[PDB]
């Protein structure tokens, strides 16, 4: 019994004065007023119950976000749903209102070196906490980095997140993959399921590059094209790195390519701070075993103004949970996961 330029956006007695925003993440987003807290908040209506995938992504995200508590990761403030499973058709997730995201910002604004440094610091600070919980985000990109007007940055969208599993990371050449193409690490196309922490560091390197130039560094138009963009900049992998790829099909593909030399980061980014480029290089390293880890990245000289490991907190314990559960049983776990926000007992 309240409408937003259709459709039904019914968020109960707490949240007044709706105001449409976007249409992302298989639902719809409005600004609204939190009468208990007296601040404007953001609300996403989620109607995922018709597709098993939507339900998977939704449960995964709610479980992680309710467990995490960190300044640089979006929190869930409230969840609104019907009082029974039967009546529950939609779920509304209430979060802090964030003005913009890095994707929208990069369309129109050039970043100062100071803004790049502070945004990168906050991304890595959030990622340290995520990785400390043994979780991989697996879809970091500018549109999943929320910003407010005071340059505070919060990571969102844990729909493809997974618990790290390096022992089961190996796969064959050209294995299909779901996360956003332009931010995929080279090993995804060669021999990796993206079950290790290094997958996220690559995505952060891509984001840094994009903050430096306002354009994606590796804009592949299709699955294999992505690998060739990467190789056009990094150059042919070195023998040691090629020897690490024991997958014959992936190794022979790399050996089949004509030799390409590295394109120097300062040719690519002539206006960039040289310490930023040194860190860039370390994040965009071909061999994931040689790729910098999140805590080393935080200690890099580029970030010296901000680095303070006592103020870079970690999760109080690892996270542990999947795809085998049907749409019906997923609705039930979602119902249980959101119980804490219910009025429940009222006299």
From Swiss-Prot:
Active site: 139
Residues with the Phosphotyrosine modification: 177
Post-translational modification Phosphothreonine, affected residues: 175, 180
Catalytic activity field: L-seryl-[protein] + ATP = O-phospho-L-seryl-[protein] + ADP + H(+); L-threonyl-[protein] + ATP = O-phospho-L-threonyl-[protein] + ADP + H(+)
Name listed for the protein in its UniProt record: Mitogen-activated protein kinase 1
InterPro entries linked to this entry: Kinase-like_dom_sf (IPR011009), MAP_kinase (IPR050117), MAP_kinase_CS (IPR003527), MAPK_ERK1/2 (IPR008349), Prot_kinase_dom (IPR000719), Protein_kinase_ATP_BS (IPR017441), Ser/Thr_kinase_AS (IPR008271)
PTM comment, free text: Dually phosphorylated on Thr-175 and Tyr-177, which activates the enzyme. Phosphorylated upon FLT3 and KIT signaling. Ligand-activated ALK induces tyrosine phosphorylation. Dephosphorylated by PTPRJ at Tyr-177. Autophosphorylated on threonine and tyrosine residues in vitro, which correlates with a slow and low level of activation. Phosphorylation on Ser-19 by SGK1 results in its activation by enhancing its interaction with MAP2K1/MEK1 and MAP2K2/MEK2. Dephosphorylated by DUSP1 and DUSP2 at Thr-175 and Tyr-177.
Taxonomic classification: Eukaryota, Metazoa, Chordata, Craniata, Vertebrata
Domain Protein kinase per the UniProt entry, residue ranges: 15-303
Residue window of motif TXY: 175-177
Record organism: Rattus norvegicus (Rat)
Regulation: Phosphorylated by MAP2K1/MEK1 and MAP2K2/MEK2 on Thr-175 and Tyr-177 in response to external stimuli like insulin or NGF. Both phosphorylations are required for activity. This phosphorylation causes dramatic conformational changes, which enable full activation and interaction of MAPK1/ERK2 with its substrates. Phosphorylation on Ser-19 by SGK1 results in its activation by enhancing its interaction with MAP2K1/MEK1 and MAP2K2/MEK2. Dephosphorylated and inactivated by DUSP1, DUSP3, DUSP6 and DUSP9. Inactivated by pyrimidylpyrrole inhibitors.
Encoding gene (name): Mapk1
């Amino acid at each position: 019994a309240a409408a937003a330029g259709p459709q039904v956006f019914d968020v109960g007695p707490r949240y007044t004065n709706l105001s449409y925003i976007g249409e992302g993440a298989y639902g719809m987003v409005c600004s609204a007023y939190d009468n208990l807290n007296k601040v404007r908040v953001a609300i996403k209506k989620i109607s995922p119950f018709e597709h098993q995938t939507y339900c998977q992504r939704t449960l995964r995200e709610i479980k992680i976000l309710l467990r995490f508590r960190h300044e640089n990761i979006i929190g869930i403030n409230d969840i609104i749903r019907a009082p029974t499973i039967e009546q529950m058709k939609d779920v509304y997730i209430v979060q802090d209102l964030m003005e913009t995201d890095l994707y929208k910002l990069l369309k129109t604004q050039h970043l100062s070196n100071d803004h790049i440094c502070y945004f990168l610091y906050q991304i890595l600070r959030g990622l340290k906490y995520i990785h400390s919980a043994n979780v991989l985000h697996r879809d970091l990109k500018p549109s999943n980095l929320l910003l407010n007007t005071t340059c505070d940055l919060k990571i969102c969208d844990f729909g493809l997140a997974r618990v790290a599993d390096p022992d089961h990371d190996h796969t064959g050449f050209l294995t299909e993959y779901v996360a956003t193409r332009w931010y995929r690490a080279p090993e995804i196309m060669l021999n990796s399921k993206g079950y290790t922490k290094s997958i996220d560091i690559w995505s952060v390197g891509c984001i840094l590059a994009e903050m430096l130039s306002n354009r994606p560094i590796f804009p592949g138009k299709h699955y294999l094209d992505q690998l060739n963009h990467i190789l056009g900049i990094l150059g042919s992998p070195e023998q040691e790195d090629l020897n690490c790829i024991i997958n014959l099909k992936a190794r022979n593909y790399l050996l089949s390519l004509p030799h390409k030399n590295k394109v120097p980061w300062n040719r690519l980014f002539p206006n960039a701070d040289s310490k930023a480029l040194d860190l860039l290089d370390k994040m965009l390293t071909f061999n994931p075993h040689k790729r910098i880890e999140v805590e080393q990245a935080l200690a890099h000289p580029y970030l010296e103004q901000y680095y303070d490991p006592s103020d870079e907190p970690i999760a109080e314990a690892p996270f542990k949970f999947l795809d085998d559960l049907p749409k019906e049983k997923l609705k039930e776990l979602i119902f249980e996961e959101t119980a804490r926000f219910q009025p429940g007992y009222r006299s």
